């Protein structure tokens, strides 16, 4: 049912994580993180944040494109490993999906599960707000306050990105 779209996207979100957490060739690990970024954008986008969902997808699409170039230069071998070529990779991949299956199986059967925290399986739609906003997007108004309210945040992040460029040149200088 489409009422569980958020839950169905979060299952793919975990499956993508098991994709790169099992650590095959970073080429295939990068693909797994793109799938998680794509569905993660979908999950966030269904809670009312379209800018946040599209932005994280946009940032991670460029992030894994640099990682792809770095994988062909410094993280490549003759036979890049897939989720089936190695027992250690395959073992961790099957284990991740089985735990995902059991958690999904129990939450949809009992409507509850207790692991550190107590989770509810009624559906994500039961916690949404029943009132409408006005003529604006609340997420957009909060993000636009960074420049009027977040003067201190803009300075530290701005300085951090500046020093970030200085640092990477220093680290990679080699002399």
């Amino acid at each position: 049912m489409m009422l569980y779209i958020v839950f169905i996207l979060s299952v793919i979100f975990v499956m993508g994580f098991v994709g790169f957490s099992s650590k095959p060739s970073p080429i295939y690990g990068g693909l797994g993180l793109i799938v998680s970024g794509g569905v993660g954008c979908g999950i966030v986008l269904n809670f009312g944040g379209s800018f946040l969902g599209l932005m994280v997808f946009l940032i991670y699409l460029g992030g894994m494109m640099v990682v792809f170039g770095y994988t062909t230069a410094m993280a490549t071998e003759q036979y890049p490993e897939i989720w089936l070529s190695n027992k250690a990779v395959l073992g961790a991949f099957v284990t991740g999906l089985l735990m995902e299956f059991f958690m999904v199986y129990y939450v949809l059967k009992d409507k509850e599960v207790e692991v550190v925290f107590e989770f509810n399986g009624l559906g994500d739609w039961v916690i949404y707000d029943t009132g409408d906003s006005g003529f604006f997007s609340e997420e957009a108004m909060g993000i636009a306050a960074l420049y009027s309210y977040g003067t201190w945040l803009v300075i530290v992040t701005g300085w951090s990105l500046l020093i970030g460029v200085v640092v990477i040149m220093e680290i990679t200088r080699g002399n």
Binding site: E112, V126, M141, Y149, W152
Partner: protein, 99 residues
């Protein structure tokens, strides 16, 4: 804060985002604004040792609004009971609950 430069200098560096009942753009309220305000006003100036026991009612309502644990349990029981009655043909849903 370990060093309270903000309070002495009179500069607000990060206090404006610490609570969700503070001033927001366009006076947009948070869903648990009333509950947070009550817990903050109950436990003002009395220390966390006292507030942990004397403002326990407000803080439990505030946590109920935040995570809705007790409401979802209540909905679960009603929904579970309705299925049991329907599964054994003992309850007819009304029209406005079906269409």
């Amino acid at each position: 804060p370990f060093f309270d430069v903000q309070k002495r200098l009179g500069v607000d560096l990060d206090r404006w985002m610490t609570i969700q009942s503070a001033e927001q753009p366009h006076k947009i309220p948070s869903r648990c604004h009333a509950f947070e305000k009550e817990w903050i006003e109950c436990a003002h100036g009395i220390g966390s040792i006292r507030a942990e026991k004397e403002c326990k009612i407000e803080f439990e309502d505030f946590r109920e609004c935040l995570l809705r644990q007790k409401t979802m349990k209540r909905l679960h029981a009603i929904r579970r009971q309705r299925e049991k009655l329907i599964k054994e043909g003992k309850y007819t849903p009304p029209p406005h609950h079906s269409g």
